Structures are given as C-alpha cells and as structure tokens.
Design an enzyme around this catalytic site. Sequence first.
Site, mmCIF file in Angstrom:
data_model
loop_
_atom_site.group_PDB
_atom_site.id
_atom_site.type_symbol
_atom_site.label_atom_id
_atom_site.label_comp_id
_atom_site.label_asym_id
_atom_site.label_seq_id
_atom_site.Cartn_x
_atom_site.Cartn_y
_atom_site.Cartn_z
ATOM 1 N N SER A 112 0.835 -1.190 0.000
ATOM 2 C CA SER A 112 0.000 0.000 0.000
ATOM 3 C C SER A 112 0.873 1.244 0.000
ATOM 4 O O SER A 112 1.791 1.376 -0.809
ATOM 5 C CB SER A 112 -0.928 0.005 1.216
ATOM 6 O OG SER A 112 -1.806 1.117 1.184
ATOM 7 N N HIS A 119 -6.891 -5.852 -1.655
ATOM 8 C CA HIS A 119 -5.966 -5.075 -0.873
ATOM 9 C C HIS A 119 -5.513 -5.766 0.407
ATOM 10 O O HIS A 119 -4.392 -5.657 0.772
ATOM 11 C CB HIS A 119 -6.533 -3.693 -0.543
ATOM 12 C CG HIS A 119 -5.478 -2.656 -0.310
ATOM 13 N ND1 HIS A 119 -4.714 -2.153 -1.322
ATOM 14 C CD2 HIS A 119 -5.048 -2.050 0.809
ATOM 15 C CE1 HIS A 119 -3.849 -1.301 -0.829
ATOM 16 N NE2 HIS A 119 -4.029 -1.221 0.454
ATOM 17 N N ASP A 130 -8.603 -2.782 -6.382
ATOM 18 C CA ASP A 130 -8.459 -3.858 -5.415
ATOM 19 C C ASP A 130 -9.317 -3.642 -4.149
ATOM 20 O O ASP A 130 -9.126 -4.235 -3.158
ATOM 21 C CB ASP A 130 -6.997 -4.089 -5.042
ATOM 22 C CG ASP A 130 -6.424 -3.002 -4.097
ATOM 23 O OD1 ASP A 130 -7.133 -2.060 -3.812
ATOM 24 O OD2 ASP A 130 -5.265 -3.111 -3.741
#
Length: 392
Positions: free
Chosen positions: A111, A356, A315
């Site tokens: 991320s 994610h 995602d």
Amino acid sequence: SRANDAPIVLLHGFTGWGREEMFGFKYWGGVRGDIEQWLNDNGYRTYTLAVGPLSSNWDRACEAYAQLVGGTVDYGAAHAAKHGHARFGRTYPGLLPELKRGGRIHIIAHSQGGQTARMLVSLLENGSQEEREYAKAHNVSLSPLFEGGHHFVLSVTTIATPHDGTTLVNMVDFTDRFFDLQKAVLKAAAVASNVPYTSQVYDFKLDQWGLRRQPGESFDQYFERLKRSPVWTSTDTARYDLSVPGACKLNQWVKASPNTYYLSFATERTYRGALTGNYYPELGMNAFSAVVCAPFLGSYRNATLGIDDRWLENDGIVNAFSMNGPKRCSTDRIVPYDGTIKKGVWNDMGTYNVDHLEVIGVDPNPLFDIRAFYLRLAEQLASLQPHHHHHH
Ligand SMILES: [Ca+2]
Ligand SMILES: [Zn+2]
C-alpha cells in the site's frame, strides 16, 4: 540462483503495526500466518518496520531511517518548522546496524509503504537540499538522512501501492469511511473499536504531533479525535499523500535511484459491468471494501484529475492503474517484466487477482497461495546482482 544475501525489510501502509502490537496478529500475514517467519524459516533473513500509519511519507521515512540504524527520529528542522510538529521523535535501538557498516537491504512494501520506501531511497541517496540549506542558514544540526550518499537499498518492491494516488480520497464521506477502514482492520485482528483497552494495542505513533489514545478512550473515540487533528487536517499527512494531487507532488521529487532495483505488483478484485464501463467488487473481496469503497472506486471519473476508464479497475482500496509505478508527475520509467530484472526502473510484475487485504493475509482467500507468492518473491530478490555488464 542466489546472488545476494541482503536481508528483507517489510513495510506497511496506511494500516500497520509492530509484531508485539495487536495481540500478535500480524499485518504481514494476518489470518494466514506470519510471513516474516515463513521467510526466515526458509533462509531469507527478514525484519519488519513499523511506522506511523497515518503520518506523511516523509515522517515515515524519517521513522524508518532511525528504526533501521538506530537513534532518535529527526524529521528535519525545516520540515518541522514548516508543518508545526516536533523535530525529534521517538528513539529506536536500531534493527540493522550492519547498514552503517556497509550492508544493504531489500524493502518489500504494501500500500502506502511503497511511497515510503521510494522516499526513503531518495532521501538516503540524495538527502534534502531544503534541509541542508536550512541548516547552514539557521545553524541547526542536520540528520545524516538529509546529507545524501547512503547506499543502503538494493531493491524496493511495492504491492498494491497507490503510486499515482487513489480516488478513494475523493468520496464525499471519505474521512468517516477511512476511519471505518481502520476499524475493519481491527475487526480482522479480533479487536473491538468500542472498548477502552488499557493496553496500547495499536499505536499510531503520533509522537511528533503529541497525540495518543487516552486512558478510558476507545478506538472509536480516539478516531473521532484524530479526524479533527493535524494528522488528518494538514498537508503533512498520509491522507494528502494518498490523493491524486498529493501523490503527484511526491512523484515530482521522489525519483528512482539508478542504483536500486524496483519491482511493482498490482492487485485487482473487480469485474467489468455489462452496459457500463464501471467495475464492481468480486465475490470474496473483503466485506468492508466491497460495500463501502469499491463501488465508488469502480465508478468515479474526474476529467480534471485525469480519472478516466483506466482507473476503474481496483483492489477495493486502490486503483490498479496507480499500481505499476509512479506515472503522474514522474520521470521514473516502467518496463514490463519479461524475464530479466532491471536496475533503476520499475519492473512491472503484473496484476494479481487478490484484494488489498487478501494480499497480506488480513482477509482470507483460499485460492491464493500467499506463502508461495512471498517465497517466490524472496527467491527473486535474492537473485539480484549487485552490478551489471553490458552484453548482447
Ligand atoms: Ca477474501
Ligand atoms: Zn512531518
């Protein structure tokens, strides 16, 4: 085959915590296990960095630097003066003093960690002219991080990184939803948001801002306070950096070192709609993102931001388009991985069908061999040669 022995260092995003935090539930592994342990068990020396999840990439980079070599975090006089927060922060023992002695590392980042790792490389290698200039002018000391010349990083790998920002920030109720995402992640870890736990559980590491959860305060309540704090309202924030304009600004100065290998992994867990070019969350995507964020991401366009149909595939948290490397306001180069890993440019490793949180094991997904993914990656990084010679 194995060409390097450098340790690996894991780096979280806008959500993340140290190994002792969250009652042992790991960010890197989540419900699936302990990724760091797997890697070590397999002969890949691996460590974990834990920095402020909501803080600016700059702060995080400064935190990381100290965490790695040891000492008191120094955000820079100039920076500090600019943004109105403490110059010095917490103190660390130092994970890897070998770096000061001449060693190197591979950084695997997830991320927003991607942005941090990039920044950290740039600061290590180039320092900060603005910090140097400020030092000479005001006669204050200077952290080595701002001088330049460090060659600590052999590679940076990013997974699900918003290199060009994420449109998630553009939702009208973004502030509320972002915090609800933190709660979701606590939920994943078997931690409630409406309990004033006495033990710390999740330390946001806001020493510079002088913020901390107070005795008797739940995460729900703390979060209420954070929303009205400088970690949410100032430009020196993850929130700002996560934005499209924010990431643009960052790309303007955070460049790829020609000395470092970069790898990028993208993630997607959506499907394309029938009559509309919109993208929708697949079955299995983490509940939170599926209901709350994915619809927005998959349907939001904005000409002035250049948000077109390419940005819709997501995602659940970040647009897939923003994941192969910095492209907005960048000089960095991206090249499709064709078998050979190249130095000084983004080796675009493709897109994986995982969300994610699934990619770090925080959300389950039985069809994704997470151990295999990380082990393959390690093998790759270990295969990187310190230097190249031209050949036919
Ligand atoms: Ca799932
Ligand atoms: Zn700062």
